[PDB]
Amino acid sequence: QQKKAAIISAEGDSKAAELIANSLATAGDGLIELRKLEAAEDIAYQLSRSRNITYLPAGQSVLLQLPQ
Amino acid sequence: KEFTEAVEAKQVAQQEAERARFVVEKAEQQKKAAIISAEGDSKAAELIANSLATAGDGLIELRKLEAAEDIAYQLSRSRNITYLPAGQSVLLQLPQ
Amino acid sequence: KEFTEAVEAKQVAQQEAERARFVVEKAEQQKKAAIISAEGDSKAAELIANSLATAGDGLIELRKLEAAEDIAYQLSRSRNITYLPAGQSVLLQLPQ
Amino acid sequence: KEFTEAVEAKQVAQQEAERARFVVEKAEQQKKAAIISAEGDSKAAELIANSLATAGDGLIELRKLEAAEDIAYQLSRSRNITYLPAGQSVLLQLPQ
Amino acid sequence: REYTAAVEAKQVAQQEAQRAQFLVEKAKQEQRQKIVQAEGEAEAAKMLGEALSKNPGYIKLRKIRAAQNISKTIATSQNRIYLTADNLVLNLQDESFTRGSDSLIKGKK
Amino acid sequence: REYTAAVEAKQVAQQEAQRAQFLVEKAKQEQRQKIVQAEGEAEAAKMLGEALSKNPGYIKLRKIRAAQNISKTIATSQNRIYLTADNLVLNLQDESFTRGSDSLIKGKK
Fold first, then answer.
1. CA distance linking residue C35 with residue E19, whole number of Å
2. Do F95 and B84 touch (CB under 8 A)?
């Protein structure tokens, strides 16, 4: 039974995927980003409760002394 | 007095010998059944292995998600969480 | 005090030298036993070696992944376990 | 006081000199015996060296893996011991 | 003490060399018992090789799932292990975001 | 104090030179015994060398299982430590994620 409609559970998740995948491959991170903002509100409240939020440079020979 | 204790230890060793006889038999049995209990959990593994050797990592993407919910609730307990770089010359000082 | 002790040491050493010829015999036997037990471990090991050599590094890595769960299970029954990426220039500085 | 002390030292020196000549002979016997206990060890070592030279490094690394378990068994009966990468620009610190 | 001990140990040594051949049998049995512990391990091994030496697919996925399970029991682990900046890319906006998430590309994996 | 002590030492040193060649013999027997102890160690040595020096299949898997017996023993291990990060490759979303263990393709390993 899980053969059948777990392949199909995939098919659901995985065509949500397919269409986003063609979406972003053609153009780029469109709703990943708009919902980086909307999920900023929501999920980065879930991830602002994330206490020691810290950012970091890159694109160079960035050498890190991260928290003790 | 100590002679009785030494004899008791010797008898304990002999009883371990008998227990090891029955471990012989238990060993026959889990020959069969541990080989094949492996076979079971491990063939879950066989097919996931082939499915992914063909394409790539499918199920812990979706289960980064599902097992995020569940066992990364069991990780939302994990007090110190950071998230690694690589592909560069990364260099580190860390928590005491 | 060294005269009687030396005489008793010579006598005990003759008893122990004959007993120890027979203990070298016992040691050959006990090494059959210890060889075959350490080789319970290590013949399990050689059949694992054959499995991973014929089949490849499958459970080389996957007991390097299943038993890698042991790292997260078992590292910090202490309090200062951690690691440091390679292919890089880490500034390793162990905790206090 | 040094007068009587030094005369007593002279007589003690005579007895100790003859004593110690024969202690050197007894020590020829005891050097053989100590070479022989160190032979227990070192001749286990001859046969191990022969074994590993003939058969590669199997237990060179597997007492570095199996008996490397000893490292975890023992390193920490105190609370400030560690084991830490290199092949990097490791700039080691050690703790209080 | 060591004299009577030595003589009794020599007689007990004859009977215990007989029992030591018996021990060789018993230890061949323990041989089988640990053979089989690590040979269930080895059944996992033989098949995981045959299914992954082709291409390490469940080994890709089980680096992922062992990283996930290692995290998962890092939860209870006090260990001051860490991670660091920029792979699970939570530089959520980045090229490295398309070099940790698009790192899933085969060839980059 | 040392005069009679040294004279008796010379006499008991005649006796103990006899008993020291006798120690040659007795400690030779304990030498064979200790040889045989560290030579069960050495038979582990032989066995594992012949088994796993041609190609470390289980010495690979024992790097593994003995790093995990070490870290089945890291419980006693108060030890502060450092593995390497690309060892546990907690680089889940990375290019070098499965440079670590697509080394399952032999040659990288």
1. 17
2. no
